Amino acid sequence: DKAPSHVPFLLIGGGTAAFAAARSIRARDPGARVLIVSEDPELPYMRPPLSKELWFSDDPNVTKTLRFKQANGKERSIYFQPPSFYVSAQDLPHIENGGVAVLTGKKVVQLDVRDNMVKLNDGSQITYEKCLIATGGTPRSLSAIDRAGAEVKSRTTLFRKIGDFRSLEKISREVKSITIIGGGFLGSELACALGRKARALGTEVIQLFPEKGNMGKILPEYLSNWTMEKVRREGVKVMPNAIVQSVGVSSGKLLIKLKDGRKVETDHIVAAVGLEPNVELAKTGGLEIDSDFGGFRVNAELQARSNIWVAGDAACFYDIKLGRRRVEHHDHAVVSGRLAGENMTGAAKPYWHQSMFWSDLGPDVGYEAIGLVDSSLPTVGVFAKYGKGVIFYLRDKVVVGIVLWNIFNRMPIARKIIKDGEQHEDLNEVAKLFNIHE
Amino acid sequence: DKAPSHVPFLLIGGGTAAFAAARSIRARDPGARVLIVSEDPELPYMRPPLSKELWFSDDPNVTKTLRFKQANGKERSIYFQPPSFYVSAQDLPHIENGGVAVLTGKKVVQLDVRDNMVKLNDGSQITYEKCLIATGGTPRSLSAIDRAGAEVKSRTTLFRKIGDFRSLEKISREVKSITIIGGGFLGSELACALGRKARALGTEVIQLFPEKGNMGKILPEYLSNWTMEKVRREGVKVMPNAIVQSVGVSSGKLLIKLKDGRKVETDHIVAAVGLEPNVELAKTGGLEIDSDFGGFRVNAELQARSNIWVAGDAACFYDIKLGRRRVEHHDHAVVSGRLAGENMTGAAKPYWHQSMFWSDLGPDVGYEAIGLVDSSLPTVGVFAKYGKGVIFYLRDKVVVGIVLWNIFNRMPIARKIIKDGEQHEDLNEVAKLFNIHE
Numbered sequence: 001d002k003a004p005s006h007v008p009f010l011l012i013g014g015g016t017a018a019f020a021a022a023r024s025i026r027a028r029d030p031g032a033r034v035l036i037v038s039e040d041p042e043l044p045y046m047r048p049p050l051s052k053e054l055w056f057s058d059d060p061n062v063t064k065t066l067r068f069k070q071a072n073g074k075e076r077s078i079y080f081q082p083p084s085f086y087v088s089a090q091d092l093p094h095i096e097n098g099g100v101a102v103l104t105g106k107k108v109v110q111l112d113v114r115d116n117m118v119k120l121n122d123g124s125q126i127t128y129e130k131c132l133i134a135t136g137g138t139p140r141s142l143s144a145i146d147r148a149g150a151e152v153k154s155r156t157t158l159f160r161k162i163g164d165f166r167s168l169e170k171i172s173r174e175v176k177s178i179t180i181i182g183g184g185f186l187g188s189e190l191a192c193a194l195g196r197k198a199r200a201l202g203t204e205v206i207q208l209f210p211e212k213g214n215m216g217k218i219l220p221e222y223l224s225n226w227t228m229e230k231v232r233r234e235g236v237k238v239m240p241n242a243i244v245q246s247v248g249v250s251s252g253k254l255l256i257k258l259k260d261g262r263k264v265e266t267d268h269i270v271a272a273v274g275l276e277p278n279v280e281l282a283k284t285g286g287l288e289i290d291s292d293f294g295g296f297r298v299n300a301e302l303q304a305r306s307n308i309w310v311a312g313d314a315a316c317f318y319d320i321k322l323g324r325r326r327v328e329h330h331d332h333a334v335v336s337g338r339l340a341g342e343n344m345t346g347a348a349k350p351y352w353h354q355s356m357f358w359s360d361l362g363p364d365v366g367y368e369a370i371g372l373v374d375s376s377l378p379t380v381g382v383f384a385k386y387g388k389g390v391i392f393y394l395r396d397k398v399v400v401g402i403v404l405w406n407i408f409n410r411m412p413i414a415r416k417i418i419k420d421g422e423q424h425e426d427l428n429e430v431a432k433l434f435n436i437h438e
Numbered sequence: 439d440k441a442p443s444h445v446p447f448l449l450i451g452g453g454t455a456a457f458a459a460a461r462s463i464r465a466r467d468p469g470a471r472v473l474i475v476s477e478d479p480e481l482p483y484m485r486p487p488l489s490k491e492l493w494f495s496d497d498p499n500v501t502k503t504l505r506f507k508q509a510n511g512k513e514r515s516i517y518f519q520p521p522s523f524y525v526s527a528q529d530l531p532h533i534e535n536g537g538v539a540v541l542t543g544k545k546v547v548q549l550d551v552r553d554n555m556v557k558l559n560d561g562s563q564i565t566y567e568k569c570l571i572a573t574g575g576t577p578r579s580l581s582a583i584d585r586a587g588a589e590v591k592s593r594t595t596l597f598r599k600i601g602d603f604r605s606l607e608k609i610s611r612e613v614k615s616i617t618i619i620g621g622g623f624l625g626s627e628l629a630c631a632l633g634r635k636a637r638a639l640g641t642e643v644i645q646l647f648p649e650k651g652n653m654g655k656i657l658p659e660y661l662s663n664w665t666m667e668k669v670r671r672e673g674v675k676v677m678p679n680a681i682v683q684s685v686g687v688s689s690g691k692l693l694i695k696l697k698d699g700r701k702v703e704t705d706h707i708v709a710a711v712g713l714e715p716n717v718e719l720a721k722t723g724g725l726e727i728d729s730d731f732g733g734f735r736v737n738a739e740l741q742a743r744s745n746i747w748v749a750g751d752a753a754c755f756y757d758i759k760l761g762r763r764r765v766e767h768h769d770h771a772v773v774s775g776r777l778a779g780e781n782m783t784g785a786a787k788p789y790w791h792q793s794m795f796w797s798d799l800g801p802d803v804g805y806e807a808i809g810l811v812d813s814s815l816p817t818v819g820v821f822a823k824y825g826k827g828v829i830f831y832l833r834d835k836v837v838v839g840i841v842l843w844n845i846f847n848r849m850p851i852a853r854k855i856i857k858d859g860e861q862h863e864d865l866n867e868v869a870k871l872f873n874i875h876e
């Protein structure tokens with residue numbers, strides 16, 4: 001309840017990276033006292049289920065329980081730990097053997113790097129010995145929607161939190177037409193999710209984006225096209241090559257006008273058009289932000305200053321093997337958050353273990369990716385029963401990124417390929433490492 | 439001298455930044471053991487005298503003694519400390535209360551960050567606890583000269599080291615014409631030095647550069663032009679707007695041909711056209727280079743990795759007040775080197791004290807500078823008795839750089855102006871702080 005005046009380990013933001021760092025610290029410093037300061041009233045929880053498993057649950061009380069069944073059939077909660085796992089912030093300095101506390105509903109509004117101090121929105125001040133910035137990011141919006149009136153904004157969801165899942169799940173049961181703007185994995189996952197729900201009600205789900213196919217920036221054109229067909233088969237009207245010119249309300253309906261002259265009538269909009277790193281604290285903290293990738297600029301060890309690290313979506317870090325990056329993946333927040341916790345306890349380790357990404361777009365599509373995955377890089381695809389396959393992303397004749405298409409339990413192989421940096425003469429032989437033959 | 443297997447503090451490079459760090463480390467830890475590895479045969483020495491005082495010495499043995507009198511008339515050596523200040527590398531781990539050693543004539547060729555180890559050109563391996571990279575930079579040459587024959591290269595000086603001063607000084611007494619290429623402070627300082635020698639000796643000194651006038655990139659056009667006139671008054675033939683097309687030999691002499699119709703014939707060429715940061719070790723070390731400014735990319739505390747720092751000309755650092763920069767100034771090497779040393783002894787403080795710059799172009803021109811000094815920025819100059827004046831460099835209606843023209847003992851005032859960063863209603867009133875009125 002009441003924030004202590006001083007804490008050894010202070011973690012800013014109560015998300016995935018923060019929780020991984022808290023567990024990492026406690027593992028290496030058993031009696032450590034870690035304080036997470038989270039503006040969100042919720043305790044740390046994982047987000048991937050918010051766009052997937054929580055929508056495919058048979059339990060009608062899922063919106064209340066926030067529980068789901070994993071791939072192996074085991075049921076669990078999206079929260080990393082139950083409330084009993086944590087200690088209260090007030091008892092954190094006094095409790096024997098320390099623990100992990102979460103100060104929910106409180107925002108760090110000022111970072112005093114000189115005096116190792118943070119100021120909260122309620123005027124409280126907390127001094128620290130080692131600080132992790134794990135603020136993640138805010139979902140971006142459209143300028144066309146920003147310029148629109150207040151009703152348009154109130155009928156637009158920026159999907160990221162538990163509150164967005166509950167509000168949107170209720171909307172899906174109240175309106176007849178939901179439009180998703182954005183072709184990325186998130187927008188495509190929400191389209192498949194709302195798509196399955198729409199079938200029970202006979203409602204409409206629309207997805208439009210500027211690219212020529214789903215994940216146009218990520219997957220090569222041919223696979224992006226195939227994926228778009230699978231999204232359509234999930235009960236989605238996909239409108240590629242769509243750039244939003246303006247948005248307004250006409251007779252109660254939302255009217256989306258595209259630059260190509262087309263117009264779309266809908267009841268509600270979901271905007272999935274990228275993430276904005278939360279770097280407000282860089283101003284008072286005098287911390288550097290990366291102008292190319294956004295976010296806090298940190299080195300290979302995720303360190304910004306003597307006792308300040310950054311992990312998760314907010315951390316623009318230097319990859320020794322792949323260059324400066326900023327990754328927005330669940331496993332990355334775990335890996336980078338875990339790494340930060342180790343470095344905050346003297347590990348002095350650099351980012352080395354490459355984190356992975358995954359996405360599920362209906363039952364027939366499951367993606368796993370790792371490394372530099374971008375459609376503008378040269379690509380070589382090897383497939384077998386359309387069906388499954390691997391896509392290698394090349395730079396300087398070396399594989400720097402891999403996308404696995406309906407191939408599971410083989411990420412270590414992909415990680416080793418990127419690691420060794422070997423110049424392969426025939427990627428067909430390399431595809432056999434992923435059980436792709438013929 | 440032989441290198442130990444281990445040393446607590448390892449400084450790569452034996453220049454100004456390295457010495458300032460060694461002095462700083464020892465000041466903080468009077469028992470520290472510091473090893474400087476220098477590819478140069480010389481002990482650490484300051485460079486500004488190589489283009490100024492050493493050429494105006496009243497001692498005809500200056501080229502051998504390398505001693506000179508400062509502005510206050512106090513004689514001293516170009517070396518930071520005499521050999522008695524240092525100990526041998528072999529005895530460094532065994533001498534009680536440690537000391538500072540300089541491994542001369544050895545080049546670190548490999549940096550193994552993982553194992554905190556370096557490899558020398560002779561195969562020796564040295565492990566460290568904390569490491570500073572102070573490798574400075576190599577003088578840049580001209581493509582036109584790179585294309586010329588070996589004889590042309592043999593008669594071109596890349597002025598930077600003690601050997602270049604001795605070689606060029608010997609030449610000035612053996613040839614009839616020397617040509618300096620480059621309009622910066624270095625080229626201009628050398629022009630004034632050789633020009634004075636040419637006065638009471640009967641020889642020619644030529645300076646040519648593509649800019650409209652000396653320090654075209656630094657000073658405003660009107661002040662650059664005024665400075666060019668006084669360099670000429672020192673006995674120099676200044677040829678602005680000169681772009682070299684080729685360099686060849688003609689009857690034993692060097693014939694420079696500019697892109698325009700002009701042609702210059704001289705006996706010797708001195709090239710002073712910028713510096714190339716020495717970042718060879720970034721490859722094996724897995725260290726990040728700055729593609730914009732060059733050099734190693736470090737944070738505000740001059741840190742690159744957990745136990746690696748960078749200082750001096752080779753350090754691209756984050757200036758909390760002015761942004762990311764890389765400065766190539768003597769005082770910067772001292773300030774950043776000693777700040778590095780402090781941070782290598784647990785200080786953990788950012789670059790906050792702004793370093794200054796100076797240049798002497800004859801007896802009637804004394805420049806001092808601080809902050810972001812760039813002719814492409816908007817400037818406001820205030821002058822009194824042409825005489826003296828101050829040049830304010832503005833960004834966002836705030837002073838970010840100051841050049842003082844024949845105004846001394848007032849750098850703390852210029853530093854304070856840049857520190858406060860307040861929008862001034864009238865810069866004339868600010869100029870009064872520098873004793874400029876009417």
Ligand SMILES: Cc1cc2nc3c(=O)[nH]c(=O)nc-3n(C[C@H](O)[C@H](O)[C@H](O)COP(=O)(O)OP(=O)(O)OC[C@H]3O[C@@H](n4cnc5c(N)ncnc54)[C@H](O)[C@@H]3O)c2cc1C
Pocket residue numbers: 012013014015016017018037038039040046047048049050051106107108109134135136137159160161186278281311312313314327328329330331333356357358359360
């Ligand atoms: C709906 C959804 C589905 C996803 N699905 C997948 C998937 O299938 N696969 C995959 O690999 N990745 C997926 N991701 C990405 C993954 O969830 C993110 O990379 C991960 O959540 C990043 O965690 P984080 O801790 O870095 O940031 P966050 O989880 O955003 O944590 C930051 C927290 O700090 C708080 N905060 C911010 N500023 C302050 C402040 N000043 N003071 C206090 N608190 C502050 C924020 O409110 C927030 O609660 C998904 C993301 C979303 C949103």
Ligand SMILES: Cc1cc2nc3c(=O)[nH]c(=O)nc-3n(C[C@H](O)[C@H](O)[C@H](O)COP(=O)(O)OP(=O)(O)OC[C@H]3O[C@@H](n4cnc5c(N)ncnc54)[C@H](O)[C@@H]3O)c2cc1C
Pocket residue numbers: 450451452453454455456475476477478484485486487488489544545546547572573574575597598599624716719749750751752765766767768769771794795796797798
């Ligand atoms: C002639 C001259 C005049 C100048 N006059 C002025 C002036 O009036 N005012 C001013 O402000 N600045 C002046 N400067 C600039 C100032 O001298 C520099 O900013 C300063 O020398 C930078 O010091 P440093 O230690 O960073 O680099 P350096 O002095 O270049 O030190 C680097 C050293 O490390 C060595 N080294 C490099 N790589 C390795 C390796 N792998 N292993 C081992 N050793 C290595 C190099 O050989 C060199 O000896 C002048 C410079 C010159 C050359």
